[PDB]
Amino acid sequence: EIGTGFPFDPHYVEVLGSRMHYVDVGPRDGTPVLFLHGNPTSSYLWRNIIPHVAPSHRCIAPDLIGMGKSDKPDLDYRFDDHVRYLDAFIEALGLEEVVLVIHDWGSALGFHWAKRNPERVKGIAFMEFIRPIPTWDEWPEFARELFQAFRTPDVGRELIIDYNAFIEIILPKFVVRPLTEEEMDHYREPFLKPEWREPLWRFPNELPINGEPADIWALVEAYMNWLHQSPVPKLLFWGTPGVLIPPAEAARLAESLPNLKTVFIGPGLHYLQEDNPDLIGSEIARWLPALHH
Ligand SMILES: [Cl-]
């Protein structure tokens, strides 16, 4: 049965005047494996994946600023805020070379950092990641009205801020198997009060859809161009029907990206880690040794 516990001792680092929480397990040296969650999750999303990798490699899984057990500074929580704080977290941990394991907005952060640090990135494992969405017709129909509403003035803030839609609707909607109450309560803990929910609303308002917002669209196109030209080792996990990465997109990536291994995880929507953590973790562990020449 999929584990609901979070058996990781807390670690904190002060950056830019705020504390960020992170998981840090495994050996203390070697190339670390940096796990980056997205919306509306935290390092809790990686709880059943990390134990597959920790016997062989250091595993570092930060909570993005304003999320998980990290501090809640008074920010807009725009994408560039998350870039700045994750850059400061990576710096404070002294990371030189890394393997990235990334999802959702954690993948936009990770691919943007990799583009800027191409000689530091030794591998990227990614799943249900951020890519330019050409129009609303390439957003899944069953979640279209909701995400259009999230991006509608006033309505979206009411849904996400006042009524906590990203936690109470989207999270269970985007896992195939049923979440348990214990798992929901872990996810709910950082957002029990509405003044804590700004990151949750800003993220869907940053999604690059039909050119907008233009700055994120440009940034995501840039790192996808980098990815298509980079020889870095790559590992993609995909499910069916998927959400950001449907099977047709997984196939396009299998054809286009260099040095790519793909793993089909079975039924999956967006939070693939909650549907098949053990295959994701075991396959990451099996893929890592070849990154060490
Ligand atoms: Cl989002």
Query: Distance (Å, rounded) from C-alpha 155 to C-alpha 200?
Result: 14
Closest C-alpha to 106, from 45, 47, 167, 191: 45
Could you tell me the distance, in angstroms and rounded to a whole number, from the CA of residue 261 to the centre of ligand 1?
26
Place of tokens 């009411």: 158
Could you tell me the distance, in angstroms and rounded to a whole number, from the CA of residue 239 to the centre of ligand 1?
19
Query: Distance (Å, rounded) from C-alpha 127 to C-alpha 134?
Result: 19
**Please, what's the b/e burial string for 10-39 (b: 16 or more CB within 10 A of its CB; e: otherwise)?**
ebebebbebebbbbbbbeeeebbbbbbbbb
Burial class of residue 179 in the structure, from the number of CB atoms within 10 Å of its CB (0-12 exposed, 13-18 middle, 19+ buried): middle
Do 209 and 244 touch, CB atoms closer than 8 A?
no
* The two structure tokens encoding residue 220: 């995501």
Q: What is the 3-state secondary structure (H, E, C) of 186-245?
A: HHHHHHCCHHHCHHHHHCHHHCCECCECHHHHHHHHHHHHHHHHCCCCEEEEEEEECCCC
Do 114 and 107 touch, CB atoms closer than 8 A?
no
Could you tell me the distance, in angstroms and rounded to a whole number, from the CA of residue 200 to the centre of ligand 1?
7
Query: Distance (Å, rounded) from C-alpha 293 to C-alpha 289?
Result: 8
Place of tokens 């195939």: 176
Query: Distance (Å, rounded) from C-alpha 60 to C-alpha 162?
Result: 32
* The two structure tokens encoding residue 158: 């009411």
Supply φ then ψ for residue 160, to 5 degrees.
Answer: -85, -45
User: Amino acid identity, residue 266?
Assistant: G
Order of strands, sheet of 59-62, starting from the edge strand that comes earlier in the sequence: 11-15, 18-25, 59-62, 33-36, 98-103, 121-129, 234-241, 260-268
Could you tell me the distance, in angstroms and rounded to a whole number, from the CA of residue 140 to the centre of ligand 1?
14
Distances in whole angstroms, Cα of residue 195 to Cα of each of 60, 86, 198:
28, 22, 7
Query: Distance (Å, rounded) from C-alpha 288 to C-alpha 282?
Result: 10
Give, for 248, the enclosing helix (H) or strand (E): helix 247-256
Query: Distance (Å, rounded) from C-alpha 43 to C-alpha 64?
Result: 9
Place of tokens 């907008």: 212
Query: Distance (Å, rounded) from C-alpha 102 to C-alpha 227?
Result: 14
Could you tell me the distance, in angstroms and rounded to a whole number, from the CA of residue 222 to the centre of ligand 1?
19
Query: Distance (Å, rounded) from C-alpha 221 to C-alpha 173?
Result: 28
Query: Distance (Å, rounded) from C-alpha 38 to C-alpha 271?
Result: 10
Pairing state of beta strands 234-241 and 260-268?
Answer: parallel
Query: Distance (Å, rounded) from C-alpha 278 to C-alpha 250?
Result: 20
Could you tell me the distance, in angstroms and rounded to a whole number, from the CA of residue 21 to the centre of ligand 1?
21
Cited resolution, angstroms: 1.5
Supply φ then ψ for residue 237, to 5 degrees.
Answer: -105, 135
Closest C-alpha to 278, from 53, 20, 36: 53
Q: What is the CB neighbour count within 10 angstroms for residue 69?
A: 20
* DSSP letter string, 29-45: SSS-EEEE--TT--GGG
The dihedral built from the CA positions of residue 107, 13, 18 and 188, taken in this order, carries a sign that is: positive
Catalytic positions are 104, 128, 270
Could you tell me the distance, in angstroms and rounded to a whole number, from the CA of residue 170 to the centre of ligand 1?
10
Do 189 and 218 touch, CB atoms closer than 8 A?
no
Do 38 and 174 touch, CB atoms closer than 8 A?
no
Do 67 and 38 touch, CB atoms closer than 8 A?
no
Distances in whole angstroms, Cα of residue 116 to Cα of each of 60, 91, 109, 112, 171:
20, 14, 11, 6, 31
Query: Distance (Å, rounded) from C-alpha 50 to C-alpha 47?
Result: 6
* The two structure tokens encoding residue 203: 């993220």
Could you tell me the distance, in angstroms and rounded to a whole number, from the CA of residue 104 to the centre of ligand 1?
8
Enumerate the domain spans of the chain.
Answer: 11-291
Query: Distance (Å, rounded) from C-alpha 45 to C-alpha 272?
Result: 10
Give, for 176, the enclosing helix (H) or strand (E): none
The fold of the 11-291 domain, in CATH, is: Rossmann fold (3.40.50)
Counts for the chain of helices (H) and strands (E), in that order: 12, 8
Distances in whole angstroms, Cα of residue 291 to Cα of each of 7, 89, 123, 212:
28, 24, 7, 36
Query: Distance (Å, rounded) from C-alpha 75 to C-alpha 199?
Result: 9
Supply φ then ψ for residue 68, to 5 degrees.
Answer: 55, -135
* The two structure tokens encoding residue 276: 């098949």
* The two structure tokens encoding residue 80: 């560039």
